[PDB]
Design a protein around this motif. Sequence first.
Motif, PDB file in Angstrom:
ATOM      1  N   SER A   1       0.861  -1.264  -0.105  1.00 56.62           N
ATOM      2  CA  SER A   1       0.070   0.110  -0.149  1.00 56.62           C
ATOM      3  C   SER A   1       0.755   1.290  -0.040  1.00 56.62           C
ATOM      4  O   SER A   1       0.814   2.056   0.954  1.00 56.62           O
ATOM      5  CB  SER A   1      -1.182   0.208   1.183  1.00 56.62           C
ATOM      6  OG  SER A   1      -1.785  -1.216   0.962  1.00 56.62           O
ATOM      7  N   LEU A   2       1.664   1.363  -1.119  1.00 58.14           N
ATOM      8  CA  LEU A   2       2.480   2.789  -1.235  1.00 58.14           C
ATOM      9  C   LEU A   2       1.827   3.921  -1.578  1.00 58.14           C
ATOM     10  O   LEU A   2       1.172   4.053  -2.653  1.00 58.14           O
ATOM     11  CB  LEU A   2       3.569   2.387  -2.190  1.00 58.14           C
ATOM     12  CG  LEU A   2       4.718   1.245  -1.848  1.00 58.14           C
ATOM     13  CD1 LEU A   2       5.917   1.156  -3.153  1.00 58.14           C
ATOM     14  CD2 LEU A   2       5.778   1.896  -0.578  1.00 58.14           C
ATOM     15  N   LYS A   3       1.792   4.891  -0.497  1.00 54.95           N
ATOM     16  CA  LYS A   3       1.619   6.454  -0.509  1.00 54.95           C
ATOM     17  C   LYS A   3       2.292   6.924  -1.701  1.00 54.95           C
ATOM     18  O   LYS A   3       3.647   6.889  -1.859  1.00 54.95           O
ATOM     19  CB  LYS A   3       1.481   6.772   0.894  1.00 54.95           C
ATOM     20  CG  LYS A   3       0.793   6.100   1.948  1.00 54.95           C
ATOM     21  CD  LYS A   3       0.686   6.544   3.299  1.00 54.95           C
ATOM     22  CE  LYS A   3      -0.057   8.413   3.436  1.00 54.95           C
ATOM     23  NZ  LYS A   3       0.072   8.705   4.498  1.00 54.95           N
ATOM     24  N   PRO A   4       1.717   8.028  -2.417  1.00 58.40           N
ATOM     25  CA  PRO A   4       2.486   8.755  -3.449  1.00 58.40           C
ATOM     26  C   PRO A   4       3.969   9.472  -2.669  1.00 58.40           C
ATOM     27  O   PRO A   4       4.716   9.810  -3.623  1.00 58.40           O
ATOM     28  CB  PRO A   4       1.447   9.891  -3.790  1.00 58.40           C
ATOM     29  CG  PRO A   4       0.451  10.129  -2.651  1.00 58.40           C
ATOM     30  CD  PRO A   4       0.475   8.409  -2.214  1.00 58.40           C
ATOM     31  N   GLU A   5       3.872   9.823  -1.540  1.00 53.42           N
ATOM     32  CA  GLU A   5       4.923  10.264  -0.695  1.00 53.42           C
ATOM     33  C   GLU A   5       6.337   9.474  -0.719  1.00 53.42           C
ATOM     34  O   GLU A   5       7.263   9.884  -0.581  1.00 53.42           O
ATOM     35  CB  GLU A   5       4.580  10.761   0.699  1.00 53.42           C
ATOM     36  CG  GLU A   5       4.133   9.359   1.440  1.00 53.42           C
ATOM     37  CD  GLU A   5       3.959   9.855   2.986  1.00 53.42           C
ATOM     38  OE1 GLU A   5       2.600  10.267   3.302  1.00 53.42           O
ATOM     39  OE2 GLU A   5       4.846   9.925   3.776  1.00 53.42           O
ATOM     40  N   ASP A   6       6.220   8.086  -0.806  1.00 55.87           N
ATOM     41  CA  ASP A   6       7.354   7.072  -0.736  1.00 55.87           C
ATOM     42  C   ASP A   6       8.298   6.986  -1.846  1.00 55.87           C
ATOM     43  O   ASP A   6       9.385   6.355  -1.644  1.00 55.87           O
ATOM     44  CB  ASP A   6       6.617   5.563  -0.404  1.00 55.87           C
ATOM     45  CG  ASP A   6       5.547   5.675   0.659  1.00 55.87           C
ATOM     46  OD1 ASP A   6       5.846   6.311   1.792  1.00 55.87           O
ATOM     47  OD2 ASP A   6       4.554   4.795   0.558  1.00 55.87           O
ATOM     48  N   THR A   7       8.252   7.995  -2.937  1.00 49.98           N
ATOM     49  CA  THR A   7       9.219   8.047  -4.019  1.00 49.98           C
ATOM     50  C   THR A   7      10.478   8.640  -3.508  1.00 49.98           C
ATOM     51  O   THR A   7      10.743   9.639  -3.125  1.00 49.98           O
ATOM     52  CB  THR A   7       8.641   8.939  -4.985  1.00 49.98           C
ATOM     53  OG1 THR A   7       7.318   8.634  -5.790  1.00 49.98           O
ATOM     54  CG2 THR A   7       9.407   8.985  -6.312  1.00 49.98           C
ATOM     55  N   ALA A   8      11.517   7.618  -3.215  1.00 50.93           N
ATOM     56  CA  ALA A   8      12.902   7.972  -2.789  1.00 50.93           C
ATOM     57  C   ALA A   8      13.630   6.828  -3.117  1.00 50.93           C
ATOM     58  O   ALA A   8      13.438   5.622  -3.329  1.00 50.93           O
ATOM     59  CB  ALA A   8      12.434   8.212  -1.223  1.00 50.93           C
ATOM     60  N   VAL A   9      14.962   7.039  -2.838  1.00 58.88           N
ATOM     61  CA  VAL A   9      16.191   6.161  -2.989  1.00 58.88           C
ATOM     62  C   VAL A   9      16.360   5.493  -1.464  1.00 58.88           C
ATOM     63  O   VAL A   9      16.580   6.380  -0.483  1.00 58.88           O
ATOM     64  CB  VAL A   9      17.253   6.722  -3.805  1.00 58.88           C
ATOM     65  CG1 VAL A   9      18.011   7.983  -2.625  1.00 58.88           C
ATOM     66  CG2 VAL A   9      18.491   5.539  -3.801  1.00 58.88           C
ATOM     67  N   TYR A  10      16.140   4.030  -1.248  1.00 59.60           N
ATOM     68  CA  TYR A  10      16.225   3.356   0.066  1.00 59.60           C
ATOM     69  C   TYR A  10      17.725   2.798   0.166  1.00 59.60           C
ATOM     70  O   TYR A  10      18.097   2.089  -0.403  1.00 59.60           O
ATOM     71  CB  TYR A  10      15.203   2.530   0.078  1.00 59.60           C
ATOM     72  CG  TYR A  10      13.835   3.028   0.402  1.00 59.60           C
ATOM     73  CD1 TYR A  10      13.059   2.851   1.662  1.00 59.60           C
ATOM     74  CD2 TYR A  10      13.091   3.855  -0.644  1.00 59.60           C
ATOM     75  CE1 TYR A  10      11.966   3.111   1.912  1.00 59.60           C
ATOM     76  CE2 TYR A  10      11.767   3.954  -0.164  1.00 59.60           C
ATOM     77  CZ  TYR A  10      11.256   3.875   0.826  1.00 59.60           C
ATOM     78  OH  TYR A  10       9.808   4.393   1.248  1.00 59.60           O
TER      79      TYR A  10
END
Length: 131
Positions: A86-95
């Motif tokens: 359930s990925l929210k639009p905010e989670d766009t990032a390099v982990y």
Amino acid sequence: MQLQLVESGGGLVQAGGSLRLSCAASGRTFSSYAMGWFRQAPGKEREFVAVVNWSGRRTYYADSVKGRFTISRDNAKNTVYLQMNSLKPEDTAVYNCAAGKWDGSYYGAPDYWGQGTQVTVSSLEHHHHHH
């Protein structure tokens, strides 16, 4: 020698979707370490997302990703995984996978850190439904 962390499994998926991540662990025995997943990209530094011990004995989750993220690791095959649900639009990032001594102090300065795996979550929930 150092602890080499190689992040992978990063990709794009829609808002409300799911994605599995991977991390190849080499160098020092990560079975003597606890490793955590941190992220950054939209005005962010490496922020606490999740942390796991080698055993899987303890799993820790940040409120932004809590209940829907889960960590796993095969100690025999030396590979870590991160189940994003359930990925929210905010989670766009390099982990970045970052391991070492976990203490208690929230000052995020790791002993070892990896390269980083770029994940994207396609924004715009889209559902207008009706006016």
